[PDB]
Amino acid sequence: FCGKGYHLMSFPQSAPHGVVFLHVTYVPAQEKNFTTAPAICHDGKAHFPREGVFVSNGTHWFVTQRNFYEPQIITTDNTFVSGNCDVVIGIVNNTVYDPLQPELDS
Amino acid sequence: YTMSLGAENSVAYSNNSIAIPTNFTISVTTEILPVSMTKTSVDCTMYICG
Amino acid sequence: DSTECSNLLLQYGSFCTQLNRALTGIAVEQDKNTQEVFAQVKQIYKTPPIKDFGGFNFSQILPDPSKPSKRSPIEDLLFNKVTNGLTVLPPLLTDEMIAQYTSALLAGTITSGWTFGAGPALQIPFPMQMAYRFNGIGVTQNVLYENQKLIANQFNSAIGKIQDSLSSTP
């Protein structure tokens, strides 16, 4: 409706008997393949991304936002737990870091 | 010639692979929309009869 | 073919030019409408040869290889169910090319979700795409993943009911 791509903003310009809209949009570029999984199996629990997606570069698993590659460590703060690992089709095994663990470890 | 719709692009679909963008383009496009016409008035008596 | 009639018709001026111009404008407007509706992608996307979409069946909407027209069963049913100086101009886009455009749109929305509509087509597994759509309407991803077989069965049943309803209603 407001240009090709994800619409960011628009600017109006007057024209003879008309209007010209300059649509400023965000276009994704330089995409890269990654291996993806619906959920992460850890401690017999299924973890799902809170806002992002699980991606793998070949050896390590990360969670990133869907529209830009920004890999982050899969923690309990960006994932949520729902059920065990027996139900979700395609769940893979990976560790889930806990930020609170070094606090009581020290 | 017989016109071509577009270049063929077979998307590499598989059940466990995703494509994530690593960059972005800020694209500005133009959209021209007419708003008004010339306001014309015709005197019917003067047009038909002078 | 009457010369006298045309000579008398010339006394009325450029009415014929106006009518021809209006009809020409309508005729080009129809082609513009078809371009605006169907030609929204400049890439002709194709489905993978293996139809592994996590239980989701799209056979009733994807083009049938057995048919020479390369139409879907639903589109084939739709085409079957629709039945002195005058000329009929053919449309600029033929039915097979319009079907090809719909096939490209279907392949893009199945293999890439909404990414192809906003830029480059980014591949994503179809259950993950459905989970994204679930999040769009405010339902968590887990609900989709846990009940994936049920959702796929319901979708296939609904598509079959659509074909039956179209085939059974005049």
Ligand SMILES: *[C@@H]1O[C@H](CO)[C@@H](O[C@@H]2O[C@H](CO)[C@@H](O)[C@H](O)[C@H]2NC(C)=O)[C@H](O)[C@H]1NC(C)=O
């Ligand atoms: C996937 O990305 C991770 C993190 O960027 C890579 O792990 C790093 O690899 C470099 C190279 O040896 C090491 O110096 C870092 O210490 C590693 N970081 C961690 C947290 O282990 C990983 O190698 C990448 N895998 C591939 C196949 O590219």
Ligand SMILES: *[C@@H]1O[C@H](CO)[C@@H](O[C@@H]2O[C@H](CO)[C@@H](O)[C@H](O)[C@H]2NC(C)=O)[C@H](O)[C@H]1NC(C)=O
């Ligand atoms: C992921 O981890 C689970 C749990 O550790 C693995 O499930 C085990 O599989 C072995 C061999 O198939 C069984 O003997 C265990 O009883 C299973 N445990 C549970 C809790 O189910 C699973 O195989 C692992 N998957 C991968 C790919 O490593």
Ligand SMILES: *[C@@H]1O[C@H](CO)[C@@H](O[C@@H]2O[C@H](CO)[C@@H](O)[C@H](O)[C@H]2NC(C)=O)[C@H](O)[C@H]1NC(C)=O
């Ligand atoms: C992601 O991987 C797929 C498959 O490995 C790549 O698709 C192939 O790309 C090559 C290079 O142009 C083509 O010659 C093949 O025909 C493609 N195969 C299919 C099935 O499309 C894809 O290019 C990769 N994407 C990225 C960004 O690396």
Ligand SMILES: *[C@@H]1O[C@H](CO)[C@@H](O[C@@H]2O[C@H](CO)[C@@H](O)[C@H](O)[C@H]2NC(C)=O)[C@H](O)[C@H]1NC(C)=O
């Ligand atoms: C993302 O793409 C932009 C293109 O706009 C890249 O910016 C270019 O980077 C090269 C290499 O440093 C420069 O020579 C160009 O002048 C840059 N262009 C502009 C407009 O600044 C950017 O580096 C890319 N980033 C990644 C991570 O690929």
Ligand SMILES: *[C@@H]1O[C@H](CO)[C@@H](O[C@@H]2O[C@H](CO)[C@@H](O)[C@H](O)[C@H]2NC(C)=O)[C@H](O)[C@H]1NC(C)=O
């Ligand atoms: C997808 O659905 C189609 C049709 O709904 C299935 O095709 C049917 O397959 C059965 C068993 O082979 C046949 O008895 C039917 O006659 C087929 N129907 C049609 C219209 O051809 C198809 O098997 C389903 N699954 C897949 C993976 O394509």
Ligand SMILES: *[C@@H]1O[C@H](CO)[C@@H](O)[C@H](O)[C@H]1NC(C)=O
């Ligand atoms: C993808 O399909 C392969 C079979 O080709 C199967 O072995 C694998 O488990 C599937 N992965 C998922 C996540 O469904």
